[PDB]
Structure formats: C-alpha cells, structure tokens
Amino acid sequence: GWKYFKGNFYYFSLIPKTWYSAEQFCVSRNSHLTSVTSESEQEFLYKTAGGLIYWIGLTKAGMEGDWSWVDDTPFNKVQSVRFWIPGEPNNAGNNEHCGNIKAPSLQAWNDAPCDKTFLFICKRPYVPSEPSAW
Ligand SMILES: [Ca+2]
C-alpha cells in the first residue's frame, strides 16, 4: 500500500499511534515519518491526507527546541515558514514538541503533544537493487 511520488514511497497508516510509536513502525519498515522539502511534496501529502490528521517527521532537537526532521534531512527554517498553519507553531500549554499535517492546505502543519495518537505517514527513498559500487 505504498504510494509513489518523485523518487519516494509513502505509507498512509490506517491505525493511529503516538509520534514515536509511529516512527518505530516506520523504522520497522525500513523508513521514517516523512520529511517535506518542497511545495509539490507538501501538496501531494495534504491532498492525499484528504482532511485527516497525520503525524509527520517534525520534532524538536537541540537545547533551543529547533524543529528538525527525524529522517535527518536538514531542516530549512526559511523555506518551511510557508508550510505551517498561521500562528503555528504555538506550543500550546508548553507541551507541543511534535508536528503533524492538519489543515488540507499548503499552510498545513501544526505542533501537538508527542503523546497524542494520530494516523501517520512513513516515507522511503526508492533504492534500486544493484551490485557493489566499489
Ligand atoms: Ca499547535
């Protein structure tokens, strides 16, 4: 049930999990909760989400609480300001350290507490089966 888009496969879960349990599910399937690194990818993801809330690989790292991608893609702060819902991230009750796709729109992301359970989206690069490149 993996959907293909620009060199990556994506898994849209049918069962809700916490942020970390979802990530462990993704890792068990040789993947990670999805990063988002372009306008077209965000569009593909929110359009496919169809108005439902999915955890993505948005989470906090460093002492600052800078946002990051659990798949280790460097987070581009400047290029990602267009992807949050206006007023987000707002850190409601000082306890929101994970991120989901919420609004069916380009401005779509929200921070929520990591312990809430939602559907989730895993992402994995297409890697062709090919011999030793050494
Ligand atoms: Ca929020």
Domain enclosing residue 123, as ranges: 1-134
Question: How far apart are alpha carbons 115 and 82 in whole angstroms?
Answer: 26
Omega before 86 within 30 of 0, i.e. cis: no
Ligand 1 centre from 95 Cα, in Å? 9
Q: Tell me, what CATH number does 76's domain have?
A: 3.10.100.10
Ligand 1 centre from 35 Cα, in Å? 18
What's the number of domains the chain is made of?
1
- Whether residue 109 contacts residue 101, with contact meaning beta carbons closer than 8 Å, is answered with yes
Question: How far apart are alpha carbons 6 and 103 in whole angstroms?
Answer: 23
Ligand 1 centre from 32 Cα, in Å? 22
Ligand 1 centre from 28 Cα, in Å? 28
Question: How far apart are alpha carbons 31 and 45 in whole angstroms?
Answer: 16
Ligand 1 centre from 103 Cα, in Å? 12
Question: In which residue are the tokens 């999805």 written?
Answer: 34
* Resolution of the experimental structure, in angstroms: 2.5
Question: How far apart are alpha carbons 119 and 133 in whole angstroms?
Answer: 38
Burial degree of 110 (CB within 10 A; 0-12, 13-18, 19+): buried
